[PDB]
# Entry
Amino acid sequence: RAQHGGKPFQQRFRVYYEDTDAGGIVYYVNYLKFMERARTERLRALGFAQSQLVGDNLLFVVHSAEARYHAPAKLDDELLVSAEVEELNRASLKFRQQVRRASDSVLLCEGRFLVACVRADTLKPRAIPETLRAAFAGSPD
Amino acid sequence: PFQQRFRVYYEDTDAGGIVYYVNYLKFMERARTERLRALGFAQSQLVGDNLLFVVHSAEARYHAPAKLDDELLVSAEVEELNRASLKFRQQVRRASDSVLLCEGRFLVACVRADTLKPRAIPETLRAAFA
Amino acid sequence: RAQHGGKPFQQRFRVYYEDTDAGGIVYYVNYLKFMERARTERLRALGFAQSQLVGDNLLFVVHSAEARYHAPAKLDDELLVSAEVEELNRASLKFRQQVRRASDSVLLCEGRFLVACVRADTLKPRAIPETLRAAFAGSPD
Amino acid sequence: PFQQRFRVYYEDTDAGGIVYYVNYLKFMERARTERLRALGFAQSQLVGDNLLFVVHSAEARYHAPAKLDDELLVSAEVEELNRASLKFRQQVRRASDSVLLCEGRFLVACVRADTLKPRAIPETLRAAFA
Ligand SMILES: [Cl-]
Ligand SMILES: [Cl-]
Ligand SMILES: [Cl-]
Ligand SMILES: [Cl-]
Ligand SMILES: [Cl-]
Ligand SMILES: [Cl-]
# Structure
């Protein structure tokens, strides 16, 4: 499917007022923004910053998004966000992501995303590049 | 059945020239609030009865794009009513031609507004759907 | 400068959870979004919907924004938002806007915006069109 | 002096391919929180002392655009400290070449966290700037 491990990639974020709602907790929709930011940072770390992606005519598009909410985060909490690849298809990828509170590791949100790889110009489906497929478990190319 | 109409503004759009995919969940949320209002459950009623609704799960499937200044029609069907929760089924369609843009499914929990603990949905509310 | 009156244009909006913060009130930044939506709706009503603007190669760009905050709005309040033109220059316009609570008319926010008119293609400064300048106090063209 | 560094993501961008102008105020807000943290005033300290900071006025002047994946440097200078309020002066610059993107000015009021009424800035806080 797609294998994960090692020093498992986590991106760290701070919760600001913009992220919160009237309840005094993170607005539930905003966890998907945090998860999106983490996928961008995982790509960067594997050698696929935004200039590299547009260089190779690659664009990633969300076709489906699912989130399950468990415990709340408050103003000024820090969040750790994973970006695992659960399955790797020819022209798409499924991400499995966890948002945890940094102080105590309690799971706040779990998300699953089906993400399509397309031509940046024309938005038509394309195969995930070789080097990218490789990166998703270890990248010296 | 019930549909709520919304306008797409600059704030909703992304570098692609289309609605940012996350934002469809906001539009669907607005429609649920408006469905509740129309069945007699505005915000003042909810805080009156010590009710708060919290999303426990959210799923969206994306089909076709919407652009700046499009109008959207958004449904808010209640597929199930459980003791302490409700499950919604929603569609976002472009107003001009009815093309399906997004579909969403949500499990929404009812909790005490004071203590945030799970509580039963009130009788009157359960009836308002039924 | 630029003259206002009549049945003074107001756009009506509802406050949803997305608009609120941890304080239980509208997040202050969001009033600028409401004011922007009102300017778009005022333009629409004067004959300048988005398809008309791109038709005439017009784009409006904010060069400055000032807001003063007075009283708070809560979840599920309705807002009335004005979009007055305070001054009309050759290639730009200054808007003066008020956000009021619908129930009791109390002033929540006042904003001022310097807005530039530019070519939609190339983003270069252009004159505000004749018909648009006219619309800002009465439009049979 | 103090600068906070931020990344521009898709969520920040608009149909123009640049940061949505409203979003610079969010970035400036984050920088004020981070300046306060570094001088010993995290959120837990503020709620500990019954303090809340509220924006009473906000001004932004826009100069040049930032794009997807740019890094931003954001300053958070305190120009004045009054009895019950503070006035900030902020600059947003592109990290790569230091070009000025936005400048902002904010009057921020100190209020009681319980009752929302105006209160004096604590001595310790006034000192931390001075
Ligand atoms: Cl996402
Ligand atoms: Cl790279
Ligand atoms: Cl699904
Ligand atoms: Cl605005
Ligand atoms: Cl029109
Ligand atoms: Cl100014």
Q: What stands out?
A: Residues 25 and 71 of chain C are 10 Å apart (CA to CA).
